[PDB]
Design a protein around this ligand. Sequence first.
Ligand SMILES: NC(=O)c1ccc[n+]([C@@H]2O[C@H](COP(=O)([O-])OP(=O)(O)OC[C@H]3O[C@@H](n4cnc5c(N)ncnc54)[C@H](O)[C@@H]3O)[C@@H](O)[C@H]2O)c1
Ligand SMILES: NC(=O)c1ccc[n+]([C@@H]2O[C@H](COP(=O)([O-])OP(=O)(O)OC[C@H]3O[C@@H](n4cnc5c(N)ncnc54)[C@H](O)[C@@H]3O)[C@@H](O)[C@H]2O)c1
Ligand SMILES: N[C@H](CO)Cc1c[nH]c[nH+]1
Ligand SMILES: [Zn+2]
Ligand SMILES: [Zn+2]
Lengths: 434, 434
Amino acid sequence: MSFNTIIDWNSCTAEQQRQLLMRPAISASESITRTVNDILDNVKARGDEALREYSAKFDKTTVTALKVSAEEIAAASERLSDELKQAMAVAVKNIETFHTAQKLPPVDVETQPGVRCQQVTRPVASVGLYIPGGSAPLFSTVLMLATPASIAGCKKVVLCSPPPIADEILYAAQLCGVQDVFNVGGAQAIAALAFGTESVPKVDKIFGPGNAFVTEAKRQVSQRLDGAAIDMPAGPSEVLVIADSGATPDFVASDLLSQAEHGPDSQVILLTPAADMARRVAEAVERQLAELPRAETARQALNASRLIVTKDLAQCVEISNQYGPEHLIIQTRNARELVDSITSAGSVFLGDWSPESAGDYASGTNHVLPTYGYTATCSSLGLADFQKRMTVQELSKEGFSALASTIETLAAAERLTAHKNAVTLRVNALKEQA
Amino acid sequence: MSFNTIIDWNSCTAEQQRQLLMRPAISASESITRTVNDILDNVKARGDEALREYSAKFDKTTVTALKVSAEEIAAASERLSDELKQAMAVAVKNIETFHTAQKLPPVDVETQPGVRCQQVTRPVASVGLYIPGGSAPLFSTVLMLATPASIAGCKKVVLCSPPPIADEILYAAQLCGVQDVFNVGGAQAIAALAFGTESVPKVDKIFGPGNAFVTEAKRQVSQRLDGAAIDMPAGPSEVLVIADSGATPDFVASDLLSQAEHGPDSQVILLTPAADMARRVAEAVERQLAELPRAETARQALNASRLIVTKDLAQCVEISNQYGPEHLIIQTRNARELVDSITSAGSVFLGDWSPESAGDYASGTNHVLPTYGYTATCSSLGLADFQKRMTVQELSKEGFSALASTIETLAAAERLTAHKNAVTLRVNALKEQA
Ligand SMILES: NC(=O)c1ccc[n+]([C@@H]2O[C@H](COP(=O)([O-])OP(=O)(O)OC[C@H]3O[C@@H](n4cnc5c(N)ncnc54)[C@H](O)[C@@H]3O)[C@@H](O)[C@H]2O)c1
Ligand SMILES: NC(=O)c1ccc[n+]([C@@H]2O[C@H](COP(=O)([O-])OP(=O)(O)OC[C@H]3O[C@@H](n4cnc5c(N)ncnc54)[C@H](O)[C@@H]3O)[C@@H](O)[C@H]2O)c1
Ligand SMILES: N[C@H](CO)Cc1c[nH]c[nH+]1
Ligand SMILES: [Zn+2]
Ligand SMILES: [Zn+2]
């Protein structure tokens, strides 16, 4: 009943320790790349016609109106329970509070007298959100994406999801101010958003995860000048828990299983200085798994899980920093004190009462995070992903005069005489008047 | 004559208008792509041996030690004039001041009582900087890249530049705290930084402009899982000037020419509501061009240049926002007031005394900026490109209890039982300890 068990880290060889922290590579798949390539070209060339043809071959009932009406949105909202609507409101309120707190303060400084430099921000003008479908869609991603778009001040916010779109997605969209929702999914939805169709607007940037085709479609459109930008590359999700002797096995196990149930390629890792904790967590994981309504997916993910025993907490921190987990959960007595030493992780959870579930749904932090090692250079999705920094400078006659010789010297040293001449012309015009 | 034809914007069909604003073509051949793919594969495989083989073919220095020594950097520094060293110090101080002002203030808020969410930043751990070479390299870019890396706290900062590396680059690197400078250029240098070799370290992110091969190599390693993240795509310098009847033709012309001299594909555009201003600028460009050592290159850039007459200033702003100029210079009487209406541009310069040369060299803003209209979604390079945002949350027993029902409701609606169970387990433990 056990597919392996506990790994004593220091008993491993140097080679094994390095492979233990490596992530499963992606097979390219020339076939998916070509299918998506053809879907993208077809949607750009033939618009809604192309989308309806695709729909006709999948849906059984071919989509007609690509845009979801206000009436369909209101009927969907009426079918939802007050309990669910109230829970979404609490979530959106916390997400809004945290992301609003991310607004950049003004950057306005005179680097030297009369040389005023500023950094200002401007919203990405139009954004497209993609939400995977199905009977039980993860509608919470709508709150995670539409909320910061709204706070950033994006002028157009639209969303695509495979028809028929669940009531929960339609209500979440409405709740967050999403302007238009369209009955399209997969690589065709990514194409419709990146290129525009008669019904779907062309957006500047596309957000949201999806399957291999959606992921490949986002990859492709981000590489074409006639395409659109995307939020961040994709890959298998992950959770790494650091637990000491004072942790509760069932809490640890429940966090590993929350992540394992997401998909068969989820990576879940435990790092602990106590072999006893590792064994107890392994038993808890096995007992809790047995009770999951549909544990087939979690069971698969657990085959890549690693329950590692280390020498101490400092080594747990060294290993986690090398891995750079999407979610880092720290169930140790001194959890907060360890944060200063964490150098790579998407979102961190501290203590016994901060399950990953709390962040996935309502704490206020964003659950769209870098995975598959991308935490090395990418950030948690945040307000900054919906806007861009622009710089501004104004030199007075005095500021310019005081900096002119320095600029001339540098331009002369790079042998860029035109750059130098733009300065000389002004120095002469100023002497001429003074 | 060619750039000398004034374009009466409103006499053009919308089709003609769109074509006028296009940047010179950048198609990147299949020839170039295969060559870069081979160089990268070969470098990942054969390391320093491969580097040296290219140091013979595409080179002519016969590199032995890849790393430039402390003694070679000291001899280089001694050869430079105090005038140049001092001008570099001024620039570095101003760049340091402006980028230090970009440090994010703390984000630490309780979205609700007992639910503490924070956003903190962490440096990208290792960064590699590419600097094109030649007898007159643009060492100023070293200051633009190394300075923010220093302020961000990047642990490793290395630099590659084709041998022989000019004294100016060696001095700039040392002045900005660069740890290692390597004698390698082109696609092989990017490959060495992305994969690492016996001599060049594998870095997390690569920055820097370059020729077609360098650019394609950066694009390729950014798309490979065995690669590195990159800053953004590098493009020929562009400048768009908005001028009213109060502008000085010679100043406008000198700014257009300052960027036209960078290379044959640079694009410069003038937008003005007065035909007389456009004609006077064309005449000024023609006479100033004739005095430039680089007139041949500038004349080539001018083939793609546009002198455009609009109906009014509001239309200048509308056209500028559509184009998304890497550099925008506003030479109007109310320049400052137009800034709020500018929504897409990399770096903006205001009034008559802010030549772009000032920002290119020493005002303190960054001259590494988005081109090709990428300002629609990308930021000017700044401190944030050398770091990443990480979120942290801690729920107290009280905050978790207040949120538990909300979280269970949401997880139940997404049919994620394990996520729901992680909360139930905690609720029950707290009930027992109450
Ligand atoms: N955001 C998160 O936190 C999170 C966490 C875990 C998993 N996920 C991901 O959610 C995804 C669910 O996506 P999904 O596939 O159920 O819905 P989806 O929205 O990605 O796509 C449905 C679309 O796929 C198209 N499609 C199906 N089979 C196809 C084929 N063979 N060729 C071309 N198109 C095809 C369908 O017609 C439809 O348009 C999984 O890939 C999973 O990894 C997301
Ligand atoms: N940073 C900026 O502000 C800025 C402004 C304008 C222009 N530029 C760009 O600077 C670039 C300078 O390019 P460069 O070539 O002089 O320097 P580079 O450093 O980009 O590349 C030179 C290297 O290219 C490789 N190479 C040369 N010929 C090759 C070939 N036939 N096949 C394969 N590899 C080959 C060699 O390794 C050589 O050392 C221009 O493309 C220009 O557009 C930068
Ligand atoms: N204008 C270039 C891109 O911003 C920067 C540069 C370097 N040297 C002279 N100019
Ligand atoms: Zn989750
Ligand atoms: Zn320049």
